[PDB]
RNA sequence: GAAUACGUUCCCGGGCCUUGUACACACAGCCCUCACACCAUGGGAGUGGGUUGCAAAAGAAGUAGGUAGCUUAACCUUCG
């Protein structure tokens, strides 16, 4: 819906934690890049506000995210 | 050491020929996946003038006109 506008929603819904996953169906080094961006848009953009991270996994076909706020 | 193919519609492989083709190493052709950057174009709240047009107001210099104030060497002086 917009270019680089993800950090907005979590905050709007006043909260504490979450769980956020994505597909990891990289076909033996094919979907690399075209599927490894649901992440690098986090760690990069996640310095500055009340948002933080708790844990991270990558098994099966879904990589769940755990988030924290103060 | 002998009971003895009635028959070639049939990709061990080739010739004659025909239409195409998403063909020239030369035969076959209807997405499942994405924040997509960054240079080029089409826009585009407002800003701003250029050059100003338009409804006017005000009008510096100069040029011209009027003019009872004021002032003055050549001319006429009647001589006021
Ligand atoms: Mg053949
Ligand atoms: Mg003008
Ligand atoms: Mg004058």
Features:
1 chains; 70 residues; alpha+beta; two-stranded antiparallel ribbon; 2 strands; binds magnesium ion; RNA-binding; 16S rRNA (guanine(1405)-N(7))-methyltransferase; ribosome
SSE layout:
Elements: H1 7-12, H2 37-43, E1 51-56, E2 65-69
Antiparallel strand pairs: 1-2
The chain binds one RNA strand of 80 nucleotides through residues 3-4, 6, 23, 25, 31, 33-35, 37-38, 40-41.
PDB class: ribosome
Keywords: ribosome, 30S, RmtC, 16S rRNA methyltransferase
Entry title: Methyltransferase RmtC bound to the 30S ribosomal subunit
Structural account:
It is classed as ribosome. Keywords: ribosome, 30S, RmtC, 16S rRNA methyltransferase. The entry is titled "Methyltransferase RmtC bound to the 30S ribosomal subunit". With 70 residues, the protein is of the alpha+beta class. Helices cover 19% and strands 16% of the residues. The protein has a two-stranded antiparallel sheet with strand order 1-2. Strand 1 and strand 2 form a beta hairpin. It is globular, with a radius of gyration of 13 Å. It binds magnesium ion (3 copies). The structure holds one RNA strand of 80 nucleotides.
């Amino acid at each position: 819906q917009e270019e680089a506008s993800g950090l907005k929603i979590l905050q709007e819904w006043k909260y504490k934690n979450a769980v956020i996953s994505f597909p990891i169906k990289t076909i033996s080094g094919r979907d690399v890049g075209m599927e490894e961006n649901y992440t690098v848009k986090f760690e990069n953009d996640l310095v500055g506000s009340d948002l933080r991270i708790m844990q991270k996994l990558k098994l099966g076909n879904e990589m769940y995210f755990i988030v924290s706020r103060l």
